[PDB]
């Protein structure tokens, strides 16, 4: 068993996986210390600052603020979200091609220093704009769309609330499956047929719920706003012809540096359950594996370590198939089916929210088709 345990029931806190919200950051910080009010003002007013053409001049007038007053993980994660949103807005502007190739030192230096501390690249990633970018409206009500808000958006009407929160709610739905993983491995060591079966049925049930949460994206995200507006600010400078050499982080590196924009490969949920169920993805060969491994380096390092530990545990699939046990096989199959359905839905969302709007003004469609078929081929 690779997974380090905090006690007999819970995985080690060193993996930064919360029992209630999973890979998401629990109860995120909403305010920085007063010392950083100037950064908070800009991130909170990004929509009207971009729209009025005021954003860049405001960032250029900022004083240099040291990150030493960011003493705990939560305030460092908030600061990274604040500075990442400001960076995306500074670089892309209004999204018409008037790009900035130099990030000013009063942002670049604290952002790069903070990113070094957190071992995350100096660009907005999933762990910022989804996993840390949320609050409850009422502390005493549950985690539902109606009771939640994001902390930051880029433009009014960009649907970032719907896109980020629905994604967050899928992560939270998966958390109820992630917290069962130690029980799976314990039942395997102990030969507890029923415990393993109930654990797998629980996982499958939570993955099914996650897909029902995913369905909500159509109700909160307009495809034209997403494609023509939000995607601009999730774009990066790796292989981007508008920033062919990357971005200059003034006062941190002399040469421009390339970092990739957002990708679905930054969520740990898919790989977590592919590993658990022994599904090896092959679609797209080395170039796709290289890209996906690169996106794993854009997850929090503790979540990378969790995924690596999972790969070093005994195999659920090998255990199950050897039992002549219809019940274990059916429960395993229910998990695989729920993962196949999630991949299938992911493909249809890419189609409606990227491939189709793009057509109006191929390797991706065939990658997502192959990942779904590899998964379905893992049905025992
Ligand atoms: C910075 C940053 C940044 C901002 C957002 C993301 N989003 C992301 O990784 O979401 C993971 C998803 C997959 N989508 S998605 O709608 O197919 C989706 C997700 C991302 C995009 C991009 C524009 C970033 C390419 C496009 C689409 C269509 C939502 C979410 C729900 C289910 C399927 C997995 C999930 C299991 C949790 C990543 C980086």
From Swiss-Prot:
Family matches, as InterPro entries: Indolamine_dOase, Trp/Indoleamine_2_3_dOase-like
Summary of the function given for this chain in its UniProt record = Catalyzes the first and rate limiting step of the catabolism of the essential amino acid tryptophan along the kynurenine pathway. Involved in the peripheral immune tolerance, contributing to maintain homeostasis by preventing autoimmunity or immunopathology that would result from uncontrolled and overreacting immune responses. Tryptophan shortage inhibits T lymphocytes division and accumulation of tryptophan catabolites induces T-cell apoptosis and differentiation of regulatory T-cells. Acts as a suppressor of anti-tumor immunity.
> Found in which tissues?
Expressed in mature dendritic cells located in lymphoid organs (including lymph nodes, spleen, tonsils, Peyers's patches, the gut lamina propria, and the thymic medulla), in some epithelial cells of the female genital tract, as well as in endothelial cells of term placenta and in lung parenchyma. Weakly or not expressed in most normal tissues, but mostly inducible in most tissues. Expressed in more than 50% of tumors, either by tumoral, stromal, or endothelial cells (expression in tumor is associated with a worse clinical outcome). Not overexpressed in tumor-draining lymph nodes.
> Might you give the EC number(s) for this enzyme?
1.13.11.52
Please provide the Gene Ontology terms (biological process) for this protein: 'de novo' NAD biosynthetic process from L-tryptophan; female pregnancy; inflammatory response; kynurenic acid biosynthetic process; L-tryptophan catabolic process; L-tryptophan catabolic process to kynurenine; multicellular organismal response to stress; negative regulation of interleukin-10 production
- Class of the enzyme per the UniProt entry, highest EC level: oxidoreductase
Cofactor mode of binding and number, as noted? Binds 1 heme group per subunit. In the active form, the heme iron is in its ferrous state Fe(+2). The catalytic cycle does not alter the oxidation state of the heme, but IDO1 is prone to autoxidation.
Q: Which residues form a coiled coil?
A: none
One MF annotation (Gene Ontology) recorded for this entry: heme binding
Protein's name in the database: Indoleamine 2,3-dioxygenase 1
Chief location category? cytoplasm
Task: Report residues binding heme b.
Answer: 346
CC cofactor: heme b
Which organism's genome codes for this protein? Homo sapiens
Describe the subunit structure.
Answer: Monomer.
Note the Pfam families from the entry: IDO
* Locations listed in the record: Cytoplasm, Cytosol
